Write a protein that binds this DNA or RNA. Structure first.
Ligand SMILES: Nc1ncnc2c1ncn2[C@@H]1O[C@H](COS(=O)(=O)NC(=O)[C@@H]2CCCN2)[C@@H](O)[C@H]1O
Ligand SMILES: Nc1ncnc2c1ncn2[C@@H]1O[C@H](COS(=O)(=O)NC(=O)[C@@H]2CCCN2)[C@@H](O)[C@H]1O
Ligand SMILES: [Zn+2]
Ligand SMILES: [Zn+2]
Lengths: 473, 473
RNA sequence: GGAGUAGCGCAGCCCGGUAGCGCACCUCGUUCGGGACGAGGGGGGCGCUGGUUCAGAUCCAGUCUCC
């Protein structure tokens, strides 16, 4: 057996590793997946980190309805125009046909708007810092596990502010949280930037995003944060009486990160041997594979369990593979496939000298005393993270490139990122895409100030800096 | 304040307190609610407790699809017959009409069955211990916030076993977890028992349950655990080859507890002054109300902020009410309404004095040295729990009655529980319900062994013990 | 033009006989330091609908699907 190497067919590698590592499986209904324990464990860790971050910045969780009245989706022009196509609709319910058909939420701005309309009255009711962990449906054509599924789990944040300034700071504060999650926890390097009009969220004034580069050279948006201005406030009549006794509109923001983030993790660190899970988000950090023969079994398994206690004490996430129906050889492969950062080999020769072998998913084995191991793993885990990150950063720089000639652009968007100048015209954008399939990823905040001429039509450059292009997922 | 007393109109008291305490609000769509932060905070605490308990008993979370193919619901006769009426159906999706209409999950046995069908192959593949935190829809007529909503959050556990024995032990293991949650965490006394055929879960062999008595004398089922036998295993072809070369059907179980549990909390401890939340589930256990005047606003708030830290240090869920725009007496009523177990009053004089006033939502009021507070609180939070539970016990004992005549029975089901004998015949049960509206709550596990004659038709008693009847929610 | 046959990957169809092989899975034993070995087993009725025939994955007709 094996696993299709990434160089042969990335897409297949992806689908297979997801299946073999038991992250998910295809669900009966079109475009859906079933998240099995190991995969969902990853999602829970992402929830915990984000939830903590969201709570430290004063947000509170709440839960709004799954069904949204079709009329609501219409109160906002741009919004309904961008989602109308991918909606799932409930028409029949309880035996009878519904008065007004209900839409399965694709996003919750509208329903929350409606409620905000009745909750916000004075300036004492602001800011409104809400978050919701849940599922959403979007009947999209062409789907991929995690990256794009009919139904998907995510977190959708919604805030309402008295001033445009406070709302914009919120929009950034969250995109920074998402970026912190990607860098400090997933070891995924990202580019914090701004989407161009053509690519922004339907109903938003502007959209900020984090863009990651997958090992196959394709870009992937892993999280978005939108400044909605007064679009929904106006659509749903969300006003309040400020301290100057003046009745004005609130400024709302929206932000979300779906389980697509799991896909980003897979396609950023995964290799031909399978998954490589970042330590800080991995369900199992250390897997202990006991090694023995009939006569060694008893004492070896006893040592292993002792080591399992010493490791749990250090607060590490450890798993002991007691399965007797498989050989060490076999187990080694399974756990490498599953992407566990460290495996500890405990054999009788090892137990003999009070030591053990520590194998790292990144490569290499080493012997250490059993007593040391507990206090040493945490630090090694951090180095593991540091390594994964510098490797990904390296991979990114090796695939980022400034282009001045359109012929150089075509070459660069085959390898990865293409830093080009653009006129800032939706018409040109569409053209470049129809021709190269590459799209606008974002206008990076930290990008160097530059002026030039559109890489394709020649007209004076826009944005005051090169834009990031790439073939994306 | 306009808080309808429970003695005047319980239902109104309920709806109002939910609204005024900001636990929830009505959603735009029929029969739905919007869980606001404070209410959802309660739900999160319930999740944390149950999840820890599920995890300690080897279960793992996963996530199955929201949409279920209509055909699946049909593979199990009884199941589709009991849910068919209350289904919401997606027919239109993505612009076109679906080949097969999709049902919004009312429960997940079927979809999981389908998946189990393809995952389970050998006994080494069992038991399957799965849990899923999510939402489900059930278009039911007559709804009440939390107790019965169109859409609702819950936890639904699904297990598959090799033997009937293991599956039945699982059924009880979970019902015990639910009961532990109700008693040790919600301070709600419950009766662990078995539903009669008429009242069991559609598709289950038998149904176990926890029944609580609300302050209005009505019974409420707060959690259920079902032994599904091979009903779904047979419907979805879920077999495996055992240690005896024999191929057989797995025995599955199902269990779930919805946010209805929040309603049980409200209607069990709530009073005319509002909510009374059990300490171990209360989002705020202590509220520090600083009292002052400009010339003292400095030291009081200083002391208050100090106490806030001291209490968080103890791991207590505290909240400081700074709000300079409200009188202390206003704040007192606000937090008595929201059910905070304790209130710490810090005034001007209390600085030089070194003491403070600790007031409990249960009538306690004492003066303690600010230094003693942090250490004393945890212990008081416990006595609080014990008291809450003690009262609910007394209430229950006072509204339970052994009846031997049908007349006495009609009397007893107006006050609460009626411990009567029954023939065990569905026809008779339906009769009693049509005449008194009371139903069968459960055949208690611990009930004393008794033989008699049906309270209504006179025929020999079934179950070998008295059945629990009551008007339920 | 090829192809739909066990969870996966395939052979069998010409020259009909009541379905087979690899991997997986069950049993037993031997194994166990980089995906073990042997023997014994369990599971499908061949995309679907006709027809010919004692008998149809196999022959005939037609319909659905993927490349
Ligand atoms: N079908 C899908 N499968 C998986 N992930 C998906 C899917 N659709 C959107 N996403 C991802 O979810 C995140 C949010 O999107 O669109 O951009 N955005 C919004 O929907 C705003 C912000 C949150 C509330 N509403 C994004 O980061 C986006 O990648
Ligand atoms: N509309 C509703 N609103 C609120 N709560 C509701 C609703 N419907 C059911 N419940 C409550 O949820 C719990 C599970 O309900 S049950 O008894 O039908 N059982 C089931 O649905 C099985 C067992 C768990 C997974 N599927 C029960 O304890 C039941 O009270
Ligand atoms: Zn241009
Ligand atoms: Zn009777």
């Amino acid at each position: 057996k094996g696993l299709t190497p990434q160089s042969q067919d990335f897409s297949e590698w992806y689908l297979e590793v997801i299946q073999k590592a038991e992250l998910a499986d295809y669900g009966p209904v079109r475009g859906t997946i079933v998240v099995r324990p190991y995969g969902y464990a990853i999602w829970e860790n992402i929830q915990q980190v984000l939830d903590r971050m969201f709570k430290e910045t004063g947000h509170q969780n709440a839960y709004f309805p799954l069904f949204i009245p079709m009329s609501f989706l219409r109160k906002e022009a741009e919004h309904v125009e961008g989602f109308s196509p991918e909606l799932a609709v409930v028409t029949h319910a309880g035996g009878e046909e519904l008065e007004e058909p209900l839409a399965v939420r694709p996003t919750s701005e509208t329903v929350i708007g409606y409620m905000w309309s009745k909750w916000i009255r004075s300036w004492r009711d602001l800011p409104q810092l809400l978050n919701q962990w849940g599922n959403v449906v979007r009947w999209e054509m062409r789907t991929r596990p995690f990256l794009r599924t009919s139904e998907f789990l995510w977190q959708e944040g919604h805030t309402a502010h008295a001033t445009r300034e406070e709302a914009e700071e919120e929009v950034r504060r969250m995109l920074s949280i998402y970026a912190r999650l990607a860098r400090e926890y997933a070891a995924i390097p990202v580019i914090e930037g701004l989407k161009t009009e053509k690519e922004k969220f339907a109903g938003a004034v502007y959209t900020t995003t984090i863009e990651a580069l997958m090992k196959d050279g394709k870009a992937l948006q892993a999280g978005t944060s939108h400044y909605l201005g007064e679009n929904f406030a106006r659509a749903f009549d969300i006003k309040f009486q400020d301290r100057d006794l003046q009745v004005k509109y609130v400024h709302t923001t929206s932000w979300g990160l779906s389980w697509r983030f799991i896909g980003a993790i897979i396609m950023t660190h995964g290799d031909d041997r399978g998954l490589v899970l970042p330590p800080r988000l991995a369900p199992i950090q250390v897997v202990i594979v006991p090694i023995y023969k009939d006569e060694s079994r008893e004492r070896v398994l006893e040592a292993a369990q002792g080591l399992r206690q010493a490791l749990l004490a250090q607060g590490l996430r450890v798993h002991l593979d007691d399965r007797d129906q498989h050989t060490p050889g076999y187990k080694f492969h399974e756990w490498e496939l599953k992407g566990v950062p460290f495996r500890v080999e405990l054999g009788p020769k090892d137990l003999e000298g009070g030591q053990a072998v520590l194998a790292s998913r990144l490569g290499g084995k080493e012997t250490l005393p059993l007593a040391a191991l507990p206090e040493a793993l945490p630090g090694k885990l951090d180095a593991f993270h540091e390594e994964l990150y510098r490797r990904a950063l390296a991979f990114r720089e090796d695939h980022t490139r400034k282009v001045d000639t359109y012929e150089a652009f075509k070459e660069a968007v085959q390898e990865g990122f293409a830093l080009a100048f653009h006129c800032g015209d939706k018409a040109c954008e569409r053209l470049i895409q129809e021709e190269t399939t590459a799209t606008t990823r974002c206008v990076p905040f930290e990008a160097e100030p530059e002026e030039g001429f559109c890489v394709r039509c020649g007209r004076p450059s826009a944005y005051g800096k090169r834009v990031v292009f790439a073939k994306a997922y």
